[PDB]
Amino acid sequence: TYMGWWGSLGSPKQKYITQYTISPYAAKPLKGAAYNAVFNTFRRTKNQFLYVAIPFVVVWSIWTRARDYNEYLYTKEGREELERV
Amino acid sequence: KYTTLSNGVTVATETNPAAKTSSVGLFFGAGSRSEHSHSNGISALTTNVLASQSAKGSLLTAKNDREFNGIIAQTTNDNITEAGKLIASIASNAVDIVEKTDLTKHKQYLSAQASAVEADPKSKVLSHLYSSAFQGYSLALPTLGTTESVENLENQDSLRHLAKHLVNNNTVIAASGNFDHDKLADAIEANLKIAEGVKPEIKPASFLGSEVRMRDDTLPKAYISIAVHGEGLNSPNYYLAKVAAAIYGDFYLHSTIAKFTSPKLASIVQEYNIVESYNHYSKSFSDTGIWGYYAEIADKFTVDDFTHFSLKEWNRLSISISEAEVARAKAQVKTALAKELANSFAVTSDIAEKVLLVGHRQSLREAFEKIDAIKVNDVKEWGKSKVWDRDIVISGTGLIEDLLDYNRNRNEMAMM
Protein backbone atom coordinates (compact mmCIF):
# COMPACT_ATOMS: atom_id res chain seq x y z
CA THR A 1 0.00 0.00 0.00
CA TYR A 2 0.93 3.69 -0.20
CA MET A 3 0.22 4.61 3.43
CA GLY A 4 1.28 2.53 6.41
CA TRP A 5 0.63 3.17 10.07
CA TRP A 6 2.42 5.70 12.26
CA GLY A 7 5.75 3.91 12.46
CA SER A 8 6.16 3.83 8.67
CA LEU A 9 3.75 6.04 6.73
CA GLY A 10 5.73 5.53 3.53
CA SER A 11 7.48 8.88 3.72
CA PRO A 12 11.00 8.96 2.24
CA LYS A 13 13.95 9.13 4.60
CA GLN A 14 13.42 12.53 6.21
CA LYS A 15 16.29 14.29 7.93
CA TYR A 16 17.65 17.73 8.86
CA ILE A 17 14.12 19.09 9.44
CA THR A 18 13.32 20.58 12.85
CA GLN A 19 9.71 21.29 13.85
CA TYR A 20 8.93 23.78 16.62
CA THR A 21 5.59 24.44 18.29
CA ILE A 22 4.14 25.74 21.55
CA SER A 23 1.51 24.35 23.86
CA PRO A 24 -2.09 25.29 23.01
CA TYR A 25 -2.57 26.55 26.56
CA ALA A 26 0.44 28.85 26.11
CA ALA A 27 -0.75 30.19 22.73
CA LYS A 28 -3.37 32.84 22.05
CA PRO A 29 -6.47 31.24 20.48
CA LEU A 30 -8.16 33.08 17.62
CA LYS A 31 -5.40 35.68 17.42
CA GLY A 32 -6.22 37.43 14.16
CA ALA A 33 -9.48 35.64 13.46
CA ALA A 34 -11.19 39.01 13.07
CA TYR A 35 -8.53 40.45 10.76
CA ASN A 36 -7.64 37.16 9.06
CA ALA A 37 -11.18 36.06 8.25
CA VAL A 38 -11.66 39.38 6.44
CA PHE A 39 -8.37 40.19 4.71
CA ASN A 40 -7.12 36.66 3.99
CA THR A 41 -10.62 35.52 3.01
CA PHE A 42 -10.83 38.43 0.57
CA ARG A 43 -7.41 37.44 -0.78
CA ARG A 44 -8.54 33.85 -1.33
CA THR A 45 -11.77 34.98 -2.98
CA LYS A 46 -9.80 37.35 -5.20
CA ASN A 47 -7.47 34.55 -6.28
CA GLN A 48 -10.24 32.02 -6.95
CA PHE A 49 -12.94 34.38 -8.26
CA LEU A 50 -12.34 34.25 -12.01
CA TYR A 51 -12.49 30.45 -12.16
CA VAL A 52 -15.98 30.53 -10.64
CA ALA A 53 -17.11 33.71 -12.41
CA ILE A 54 -16.27 32.97 -16.05
CA PRO A 55 -18.01 29.56 -16.05
CA PHE A 56 -20.85 31.02 -14.01
CA VAL A 57 -21.14 33.99 -16.34
CA VAL A 58 -21.27 31.72 -19.39
CA VAL A 59 -23.82 29.30 -17.93
CA TRP A 60 -26.02 32.04 -16.49
CA SER A 61 -25.94 33.96 -19.77
CA ILE A 62 -27.13 30.84 -21.58
CA TRP A 63 -29.80 30.31 -18.93
CA THR A 64 -30.94 33.94 -19.12
CA ARG A 65 -31.22 33.94 -22.91
CA ALA A 66 -33.15 30.66 -22.80
CA ARG A 67 -35.47 31.89 -20.05
CA ASP A 68 -36.12 35.22 -21.77
CA TYR A 69 -36.88 33.50 -25.07
CA ASN A 70 -39.27 31.12 -23.32
CA GLU A 71 -41.04 34.02 -21.62
CA TYR A 72 -41.28 35.83 -24.95
CA LEU A 73 -42.80 32.82 -26.71
CA TYR A 74 -45.76 32.49 -24.32
CA THR A 75 -47.17 35.95 -24.96
CA LYS A 76 -49.61 37.49 -27.41
CA GLU A 77 -46.73 38.71 -29.59
CA GLY A 78 -44.90 35.39 -29.28
CA ARG A 79 -47.89 33.34 -30.43
CA GLU A 80 -46.83 33.17 -34.08
CA GLU A 81 -43.23 32.25 -33.26
CA LEU A 82 -44.41 29.58 -30.83
CA GLU A 83 -46.66 28.17 -33.55
CA ARG A 84 -43.79 28.07 -36.04
CA VAL A 85 -41.88 25.91 -33.55
CA LYS B 1 33.53 25.32 56.45
CA TYR B 2 33.54 28.88 55.12
CA THR B 3 35.97 31.79 55.24
CA THR B 4 35.48 35.12 53.46
CA LEU B 5 38.95 36.25 52.43
CA SER B 6 40.10 39.73 51.62
CA ASN B 7 38.56 40.93 48.35
CA GLY B 8 35.35 39.39 49.71
CA VAL B 9 35.84 36.06 47.93
CA THR B 10 34.56 33.09 49.93
CA VAL B 11 36.46 29.83 50.35
CA ALA B 12 34.12 26.93 51.08
CA THR B 13 35.63 23.55 51.83
CA GLU B 14 34.20 20.17 52.84
CA THR B 15 37.23 18.36 54.25
CA ASN B 16 37.00 14.71 55.27
CA PRO B 17 40.00 12.55 56.28
CA ALA B 18 38.61 9.54 54.40
CA ALA B 19 38.82 11.30 51.02
CA LYS B 20 40.97 9.47 48.48
CA THR B 21 42.04 12.58 46.56
CA SER B 22 41.71 16.32 47.08
CA SER B 23 40.34 19.01 44.80
CA VAL B 24 40.09 22.80 44.77
CA GLY B 25 38.46 25.00 42.17
CA LEU B 26 37.62 28.62 41.41
CA PHE B 27 34.10 29.09 40.05
CA PHE B 28 32.85 32.49 38.90
CA GLY B 29 29.22 31.81 38.02
CA ALA B 30 27.85 33.16 34.74
CA GLY B 31 27.58 30.04 32.61
CA SER B 32 25.73 30.01 29.32
CA ARG B 33 22.78 31.63 31.09
CA SER B 34 24.77 34.87 31.20
CA GLU B 35 25.52 34.84 27.46
CA HIS B 36 23.52 35.93 24.43
CA SER B 37 23.22 34.34 21.02
CA HIS B 38 25.99 36.33 19.34
CA SER B 39 28.56 35.64 22.09
CA ASN B 40 27.29 32.23 23.19
CA GLY B 41 29.93 29.74 24.26
CA ILE B 42 32.35 32.45 25.39
CA SER B 43 32.18 31.30 29.01
CA ALA B 44 33.12 27.75 28.07
CA LEU B 45 35.88 28.97 25.75
CA THR B 46 37.33 31.21 28.46
CA THR B 47 37.25 28.45 31.06
CA ASN B 48 38.90 26.06 28.60
CA VAL B 49 41.63 28.63 27.92
CA LEU B 50 42.21 29.09 31.64
CA ALA B 51 42.22 25.34 32.34
CA SER B 52 44.60 24.65 29.43
CA GLN B 53 47.44 26.37 31.31
CA SER B 54 50.41 24.62 32.88
CA ALA B 55 49.21 22.26 35.61
CA LYS B 56 52.46 21.99 37.62
CA GLY B 57 51.65 18.36 38.37
CA SER B 58 47.98 18.85 39.25
CA LEU B 59 44.97 18.11 37.04
CA LEU B 60 43.32 21.27 35.70
CA THR B 61 39.87 20.84 34.19
CA ALA B 62 37.11 23.19 33.10
CA LYS B 63 33.54 22.98 34.40
CA ASN B 64 31.41 24.77 31.78
CA ASP B 65 28.00 24.41 33.40
CA ARG B 66 24.74 26.09 32.38
CA GLU B 67 24.78 28.76 35.10
CA PHE B 68 28.35 28.68 36.44
CA ASN B 69 31.89 28.09 35.21
CA GLY B 70 35.12 27.28 36.97
CA ILE B 71 38.52 25.65 36.88
CA ILE B 72 39.17 22.66 39.15
CA ALA B 73 42.67 21.44 40.04
CA GLN B 74 42.34 17.87 41.26
CA THR B 75 45.42 16.64 43.09
CA THR B 76 46.58 14.24 45.75
CA ASN B 77 45.93 15.37 49.30
CA ASP B 78 49.39 16.56 50.33
CA ASN B 79 49.76 18.61 47.14
CA ILE B 80 46.46 20.44 47.61
CA THR B 81 47.96 23.71 48.83
CA GLU B 82 50.12 23.88 45.70
CA ALA B 83 47.05 23.33 43.54
CA GLY B 84 45.44 26.12 45.53
CA LYS B 85 48.14 28.56 44.52
CA LEU B 86 47.96 27.25 40.96
CA ILE B 87 44.31 28.13 40.43
CA ALA B 88 44.81 31.43 42.23
CA SER B 89 47.53 32.32 39.74
CA ILE B 90 45.39 31.07 36.87
CA ALA B 91 42.68 33.52 37.92
CA SER B 92 44.92 36.40 38.99
CA ASN B 93 46.41 36.29 35.47
CA ALA B 94 43.17 35.45 33.65
CA VAL B 95 43.12 38.57 31.48
CA ASP B 96 46.83 38.20 30.69
CA ILE B 97 46.39 34.52 29.85
CA VAL B 98 43.47 35.26 27.53
CA GLU B 99 45.30 38.14 25.83
CA LYS B 100 48.36 36.01 25.04
CA THR B 101 46.22 33.12 23.75
CA ASP B 102 45.69 31.99 20.16
CA LEU B 103 42.07 30.85 20.32
CA THR B 104 42.17 28.87 17.06
CA LYS B 105 43.07 25.58 18.74
CA HIS B 106 40.75 26.22 21.69
CA LYS B 107 37.87 27.19 19.41
CA GLN B 108 38.48 24.01 17.40
CA TYR B 109 38.30 21.97 20.61
CA LEU B 110 35.16 23.77 21.78
CA SER B 111 33.46 23.24 18.42
CA ALA B 112 34.43 19.57 18.62
CA GLN B 113 32.72 19.34 22.01
CA ALA B 114 29.69 21.20 20.66
CA SER B 115 29.40 18.71 17.81
CA ALA B 116 29.86 15.90 20.34
CA VAL B 117 26.80 17.04 22.29
CA GLU B 118 25.07 17.33 18.89
CA ALA B 119 25.84 13.68 18.09
CA ASP B 120 25.39 11.81 21.37
CA PRO B 121 21.61 11.36 21.06
CA LYS B 122 20.87 11.87 24.76
CA SER B 123 22.97 15.03 24.92
CA LYS B 124 21.27 16.36 21.79
CA VAL B 125 17.81 15.50 23.10
CA LEU B 126 18.29 17.17 26.47
CA SER B 127 20.01 20.21 24.97
CA HIS B 128 17.09 20.68 22.59
CA LEU B 129 14.64 20.11 25.44
CA TYR B 130 16.23 22.83 27.55
CA SER B 131 16.47 25.15 24.55
CA SER B 132 12.79 24.79 23.64
CA ALA B 133 11.51 24.84 27.22
CA PHE B 134 13.24 28.15 28.02
CA GLN B 135 13.13 29.48 24.47
CA GLY B 136 13.56 33.23 24.15
CA TYR B 137 15.89 33.52 27.16
CA SER B 138 19.61 33.06 27.66
CA LEU B 139 18.96 29.85 29.60
CA ALA B 140 18.03 28.21 26.29
CA LEU B 141 21.60 28.53 25.03
CA PRO B 142 23.92 25.49 25.13
CA THR B 143 26.49 25.19 27.88
CA LEU B 144 29.20 24.79 25.23
CA GLY B 145 27.60 26.99 22.57
CA THR B 146 26.87 26.10 18.95
CA THR B 147 29.36 25.26 16.22
CA GLU B 148 28.32 28.44 14.40
CA SER B 149 28.82 30.96 17.22
CA VAL B 150 32.08 29.50 18.56
CA GLU B 151 33.99 30.32 15.38
CA ASN B 152 32.80 33.93 15.74
CA LEU B 153 34.41 34.43 19.17
CA GLU B 154 37.59 36.42 19.74
CA ASN B 155 39.93 37.30 22.58
CA GLN B 156 38.28 40.66 23.23
CA ASP B 157 34.88 39.06 23.84
CA SER B 158 36.45 36.68 26.35
CA LEU B 159 38.15 39.61 28.08
CA ARG B 160 34.81 41.41 28.35
CA HIS B 161 33.21 38.27 29.76
CA LEU B 162 35.96 37.88 32.35
CA ALA B 163 35.85 41.53 33.37
CA LYS B 164 32.08 41.34 33.83
CA HIS B 165 31.89 37.96 35.58
CA LEU B 166 35.32 37.18 37.09
CA VAL B 167 34.83 39.46 40.08
CA ASN B 168 35.10 38.94 43.82
CA ASN B 169 31.37 39.15 44.54
CA ASN B 170 30.67 36.63 41.74
CA THR B 171 33.33 34.01 42.54
CA VAL B 172 33.91 31.23 45.06
CA ILE B 173 36.82 28.92 45.89
CA ALA B 174 35.43 25.45 46.57
CA ALA B 175 37.52 22.62 47.97
CA SER B 176 37.29 19.08 49.27
CA GLY B 177 39.55 16.26 50.37
CA ASN B 178 41.84 15.64 53.32
CA PHE B 179 43.63 18.84 54.27
CA ASP B 180 43.67 21.64 56.81
CA HIS B 181 41.25 24.31 55.59
CA ASP B 182 43.23 27.17 57.12
CA LYS B 183 46.36 26.24 55.17
CA LEU B 184 44.50 26.33 51.86
CA ALA B 185 42.78 29.60 52.73
CA ASP B 186 46.10 31.21 53.65
CA ALA B 187 47.77 29.90 50.49
CA ILE B 188 45.00 31.29 48.29
CA GLU B 189 44.81 34.63 50.11
CA ALA B 190 48.43 35.50 49.31
CA ASN B 191 47.95 34.57 45.64
CA LEU B 192 44.36 35.45 44.66
CA LYS B 193 44.03 38.89 43.05
CA ILE B 194 40.86 39.48 41.03
CA ALA B 195 39.07 42.68 40.12
CA GLU B 196 36.29 44.13 42.22
CA GLY B 197 32.74 44.20 40.91
CA VAL B 198 29.09 43.64 41.72
CA LYS B 199 27.53 40.23 41.21
CA PRO B 200 26.06 40.28 37.69
CA GLU B 201 22.28 40.06 37.67
CA ILE B 202 21.18 36.53 36.82
CA LYS B 203 19.10 36.69 33.66
CA PRO B 204 15.44 35.65 33.96
CA ALA B 205 13.91 32.54 32.45
CA SER B 206 10.36 31.23 32.19
CA PHE B 207 9.26 27.76 31.14
CA LEU B 208 7.26 27.60 27.90
CA GLY B 209 5.59 24.31 27.05
CA SER B 210 6.71 23.44 23.53
CA GLU B 211 7.84 20.62 21.28
CA VAL B 212 10.92 20.21 19.10
CA ARG B 213 11.36 17.32 16.65
CA MET B 214 14.73 16.78 14.96
CA ARG B 215 13.44 13.70 13.15
CA ASP B 216 16.38 11.88 11.55
CA ASP B 217 15.06 8.66 10.02
CA THR B 218 18.58 7.25 9.56
CA LEU B 219 19.15 6.68 13.29
CA PRO B 220 18.54 3.23 14.80
CA LYS B 221 16.25 4.32 17.65
CA ALA B 222 13.90 7.06 18.78
CA TYR B 223 15.47 9.26 21.45
CA ILE B 224 12.71 11.30 23.08
CA SER B 225 12.48 13.31 26.26
CA ILE B 226 9.36 14.69 27.92
CA ALA B 227 9.43 17.04 30.88
CA VAL B 228 7.54 19.69 32.83
CA HIS B 229 8.60 22.80 34.71
CA GLY B 230 10.50 21.33 37.63
CA GLU B 231 12.10 22.69 40.80
CA GLY B 232 15.18 24.88 40.91
CA LEU B 233 17.82 24.67 43.61
CA ASN B 234 15.96 27.35 45.58
CA SER B 235 12.60 25.62 45.83
CA PRO B 236 11.85 23.68 49.04
CA ASN B 237 10.43 20.99 46.73
CA TYR B 238 13.93 20.34 45.36
CA TYR B 239 14.34 17.04 47.20
CA LEU B 240 10.61 16.45 46.83
CA ALA B 241 11.02 16.77 43.07
CA LYS B 242 13.91 14.31 43.21
CA VAL B 243 11.73 11.87 45.16
CA ALA B 244 8.90 12.26 42.65
CA ALA B 245 11.30 11.51 39.80
CA ALA B 246 12.80 8.53 41.62
CA ILE B 247 9.34 7.02 42.17
CA TYR B 248 9.62 6.08 38.49
CA GLY B 249 13.38 5.72 38.53
CA ASP B 250 15.57 4.36 35.76
CA PHE B 251 15.29 1.38 33.44
CA TYR B 252 17.38 -0.45 30.84
CA LEU B 253 15.68 -3.26 28.96
CA HIS B 254 18.75 -5.49 28.68
CA SER B 255 19.85 -4.97 32.28
CA THR B 256 19.52 -8.15 34.31
CA ILE B 257 17.25 -6.48 36.89
CA ALA B 258 14.96 -5.27 34.11
CA LYS B 259 12.37 -7.93 34.94
CA PHE B 260 12.55 -7.08 38.66
CA THR B 261 12.80 -3.29 38.98
CA SER B 262 10.23 -1.87 41.37
CA PRO B 263 8.72 0.96 39.28
CA LYS B 264 5.34 0.10 37.81
CA LEU B 265 6.31 1.68 34.49
CA ALA B 266 9.13 -0.85 34.22
CA SER B 267 6.78 -3.81 34.61
CA ILE B 268 4.34 -2.19 32.17
CA VAL B 269 6.97 -1.75 29.46
CA GLN B 270 8.25 -5.33 29.18
CA GLU B 271 4.86 -6.75 28.21
CA TYR B 272 5.52 -5.74 24.59
CA ASN B 273 9.05 -4.37 25.13
CA ILE B 274 7.77 -0.89 24.38
CA VAL B 275 10.98 0.96 25.26
CA GLU B 276 14.65 0.03 25.29
CA SER B 277 15.67 2.35 28.12
CA TYR B 278 14.61 5.42 30.04
CA ASN B 279 15.53 7.46 33.08
CA HIS B 280 13.57 10.00 35.10
CA TYR B 281 15.45 13.11 36.16
CA SER B 282 14.92 16.41 37.97
CA LYS B 283 17.41 18.85 36.50
CA SER B 284 17.57 21.90 38.76
CA PHE B 285 18.92 25.32 37.83
CA SER B 286 19.33 28.35 40.09
CA ASP B 287 15.63 29.29 40.08
CA THR B 288 13.92 26.92 37.63
CA GLY B 289 14.11 23.26 36.72
CA ILE B 290 13.04 20.55 34.31
CA TRP B 291 11.43 17.41 35.76
CA GLY B 292 10.73 14.54 33.41
CA TYR B 293 12.23 11.55 31.63
CA TYR B 294 14.53 10.69 28.77
CA ALA B 295 13.91 7.52 26.80
CA GLU B 296 15.31 5.50 23.91
CA ILE B 297 12.81 3.30 22.05
CA ALA B 298 14.19 0.64 19.74
CA ASP B 299 10.89 -0.40 18.14
CA LYS B 300 9.82 2.56 16.03
CA PHE B 301 6.18 1.41 16.23
CA THR B 302 5.90 1.82 20.02
CA VAL B 303 6.85 5.45 20.68
CA ASP B 304 3.20 6.37 21.16
CA ASP B 305 2.63 3.43 23.50
CA PHE B 306 5.59 4.40 25.66
CA THR B 307 4.59 8.05 25.88
CA HIS B 308 1.02 7.04 26.72
CA PHE B 309 2.06 4.64 29.47
CA SER B 310 4.67 6.98 30.95
CA LEU B 311 2.27 9.91 31.13
CA LYS B 312 -0.39 7.64 32.64
CA GLU B 313 2.14 6.67 35.29
CA TRP B 314 2.76 10.38 35.87
CA ASN B 315 -0.99 10.81 36.35
CA ARG B 316 -0.67 8.07 38.96
CA LEU B 317 1.66 10.43 40.86
CA SER B 318 -1.14 12.72 42.05
CA ILE B 319 -3.62 9.95 42.91
CA SER B 320 -2.39 6.45 43.64
CA ILE B 321 1.29 6.39 44.64
CA SER B 322 1.50 4.02 47.60
CA GLU B 323 3.68 4.27 50.68
CA ALA B 324 5.94 1.56 49.27
CA GLU B 325 6.79 3.63 46.20
CA VAL B 326 7.40 6.76 48.27
CA ALA B 327 9.65 4.88 50.70
CA ARG B 328 11.60 3.36 47.82
CA ALA B 329 11.96 6.75 46.15
CA LYS B 330 13.17 8.37 49.37
CA ALA B 331 15.76 5.65 49.92
CA GLN B 332 16.92 5.76 46.29
CA VAL B 333 17.20 9.56 46.31
CA LYS B 334 19.22 9.47 49.53
CA THR B 335 21.55 6.85 48.06
CA ALA B 336 21.90 8.83 44.82
CA LEU B 337 22.72 12.03 46.69
CA ALA B 338 25.36 10.21 48.71
CA LYS B 339 26.79 8.69 45.52
CA GLU B 340 27.01 12.05 43.76
CA LEU B 341 29.06 13.39 46.69
CA ALA B 342 31.72 10.66 46.97
CA ASN B 343 34.30 11.88 44.46
CA SER B 344 36.09 14.94 45.79
CA PHE B 345 35.76 16.47 42.33
CA ALA B 346 32.00 16.01 42.52
CA VAL B 347 31.90 17.44 46.04
CA THR B 348 33.88 20.48 44.88
CA SER B 349 31.52 20.98 41.94
CA ASP B 350 28.47 20.68 44.20
CA ILE B 351 29.93 23.08 46.77
CA ALA B 352 30.63 25.64 44.07
CA GLU B 353 27.21 25.21 42.47
CA LYS B 354 25.30 25.58 45.73
CA VAL B 355 27.37 28.45 47.12
CA LEU B 356 27.07 30.40 43.87
CA LEU B 357 23.44 29.67 43.06
CA VAL B 358 21.69 29.40 46.45
CA GLY B 359 24.28 30.88 48.79
CA HIS B 360 24.11 28.03 51.31
CA ARG B 361 24.82 24.32 50.91
CA GLN B 362 22.72 21.89 52.93
CA SER B 363 24.91 19.20 54.46
CA LEU B 364 24.20 15.63 53.46
CA ARG B 365 22.74 14.88 56.90
CA GLU B 366 20.37 17.83 56.52
CA ALA B 367 19.37 16.56 53.08
CA PHE B 368 18.71 13.10 54.54
CA GLU B 369 16.60 14.61 57.32
CA LYS B 370 14.65 16.67 54.78
CA ILE B 371 14.04 13.66 52.52
CA ASP B 372 13.00 11.44 55.43
CA ALA B 373 10.31 13.97 56.39
CA ILE B 374 8.53 13.50 53.05
CA LYS B 375 5.16 11.77 53.34
CA VAL B 376 3.16 10.27 50.50
CA ASN B 377 0.69 13.14 50.79
CA ASP B 378 3.54 15.61 50.26
CA VAL B 379 4.50 13.84 47.04
CA LYS B 380 0.88 13.81 45.88
CA GLU B 381 0.52 17.53 46.64
CA TRP B 382 3.64 18.16 44.57
CA GLY B 383 2.25 16.01 41.78
CA LYS B 384 -0.97 18.02 41.74
CA SER B 385 0.98 21.28 41.84
CA LYS B 386 3.64 20.66 39.20
CA VAL B 387 2.73 17.54 37.17
CA TRP B 388 -1.04 17.09 36.97
CA ASP B 389 -2.51 18.94 33.99
CA ARG B 390 0.61 21.04 33.41
CA ASP B 391 2.36 22.01 30.20
CA ILE B 392 5.04 19.65 28.93
CA VAL B 393 8.14 20.18 26.80
CA ILE B 394 9.01 17.47 24.29
CA SER B 395 12.12 16.60 22.30
CA GLY B 396 12.85 13.89 19.77
CA THR B 397 15.67 13.01 17.40
CA GLY B 398 15.10 9.91 15.26
CA LEU B 399 12.33 7.60 14.13
CA ILE B 400 9.91 9.83 16.04
CA GLU B 401 7.38 9.59 13.23
CA ASP B 402 5.33 7.55 15.71
CA LEU B 403 5.66 10.27 18.38
CA LEU B 404 2.19 11.78 18.17
CA ASP B 405 1.61 15.52 18.10
CA TYR B 406 1.81 17.78 21.14
CA ASN B 407 -1.90 17.70 21.96
CA ARG B 408 -2.04 13.94 22.46
CA ASN B 409 0.84 13.85 24.95
CA ARG B 410 -0.38 17.01 26.69
CA ASN B 411 -3.91 15.65 27.09
CA GLU B 412 -2.41 12.44 28.47
CA MET B 413 -1.38 14.58 31.47
CA ALA B 414 -4.89 14.96 32.93
CA MET B 415 -6.93 11.82 32.09
CA MET B 416 -7.78 10.24 35.47
From Swiss-Prot, chain A:
Protein keywords: Electron transport, Membrane, Mitochondrion, Mitochondrion inner membrane, Respiratory chain, Transmembrane, Transmembrane helix, Transport
One Pfam family from the record: UcrQ
Topology term for the membrane: Single-pass membrane protein
One of the record's GO cellular component terms: plasma membrane
One Gene Ontology molecular-function label: ubiquinol-cytochrome-c reductase activity
Highest taxon in the source lineage: Eukaryota
Disrupted-gene phenotype: Leads to decreased vegetative growth on several carbon sources including maltose, citrate and acetate.
UniProt induction comment: Expression is up-regulated in cells that undergo morphogenesis to form pseudohyphal cells when co-incubated with macrophages. The promoter contains the conserved motif 5'-TGAAAA(G/T)GAAG-3' found in morphogenesis up-regulated genes involved in energy generation including ATP2, ATP3, ATP4, ATP20, QCR8, COX4, and SDH1. Expression is repressed during formation os spider biofilm. Expression is repressed by HAP43.
SUPFAM superfamilies tied to this protein: Ubiquinone-binding protein QP-C of cytochrome bc1 complex (Ubiquinol-cytochrome c reductase) (SSF81508)
Subcellular localization: Membrane; Mitochondrion inner membrane
A Gene Ontology BP annotation from the UniProt entry: mitochondrial electron transport, ubiquinol to cytochrome c
TM spans (from-to): 49-66
Keyword Zinc part of the UniProt annotation: no
Functional description taken from the UniProt entry: Component of the ubiquinol-cytochrome c oxidoreductase, a multisubunit transmembrane complex that is part of the mitochondrial electron transport chain which drives oxidative phosphorylation. The complex plays an important role in the uptake of multiple carbon sources present in different host niches.
Family stated for the protein in its record: Belongs to the UQCRQ/QCR8 family.
Subunit description: Component of the ubiquinol-cytochrome c oxidoreductase (cytochrome b-c1 complex, complex III, CIII), a multisubunit enzyme composed of 10 subunits. The complex is composed of 3 respiratory subunits cytochrome b (COB), cytochrome c1 (CYT1) and Rieske protein (RIP1), 2 core protein subunits COR1 and QCR2, and 5 low-molecular weight protein subunits QCR6, QCR7, QCR8, QCR9 and QCR10.
Protein name: Cytochrome b-c1 complex subunit 8, mitochondrial
Organism, as annotated: Candida albicans (strain SC5314 / ATCC MYA-2876)
UniProtKB/Swiss-Prot annotation, chain B:
Membrane topology designation: Peripheral membrane protein
Induction notes from the record: Expression is induced in the presence of amphotericin B. Expression is repressed by niric oxide and during spider biofilm formation. Expression is also repressed by HAP43.
An annotated GO cellular component: mitochondrion
Pfam families on file: Peptidase_M16, Peptidase_M16_C
Primary location group: mitochondrion
SUPFAM superfamilies linked: LuxS/MPP-like metallohydrolase
GO biological process, one term: protein processing involved in protein targeting to mitochondrion
Localisation per UniProt entry: Mitochondrion inner membrane
Reported phenotype of the disruption mutant: Leads to decreased vegetative growth on several carbon sources including maltose, citrate and acetate.
An example molecular function term from Gene Ontology annotations: metal ion binding
Signal sequence bounds: none
Stated family: Belongs to the peptidase M16 family. UQCRC1/QCR1 subfamily.
Function: Component of the ubiquinol-cytochrome c oxidoreductase, a multisubunit transmembrane complex that is part of the mitochondrial electron transport chain which drives oxidative phosphorylation. The complex plays an important role in the uptake of multiple carbon sources present in different host niches.
Subunit architecture: Component of the ubiquinol-cytochrome c oxidoreductase (cytochrome b-c1 complex, complex III, CIII), a multisubunit enzyme composed of 10 subunits. The complex is composed of 3 respiratory subunits cytochrome b (COB), cytochrome c1 (CYT1) and Rieske protein (RIP1), 2 core protein subunits COR1 and QCR2, and 5 low-molecular weight protein subunits QCR6, QCR7, QCR8, QCR9 and QCR10.
Entry protein name: Cytochrome b-c1 complex reductase subunit, mitochondrial
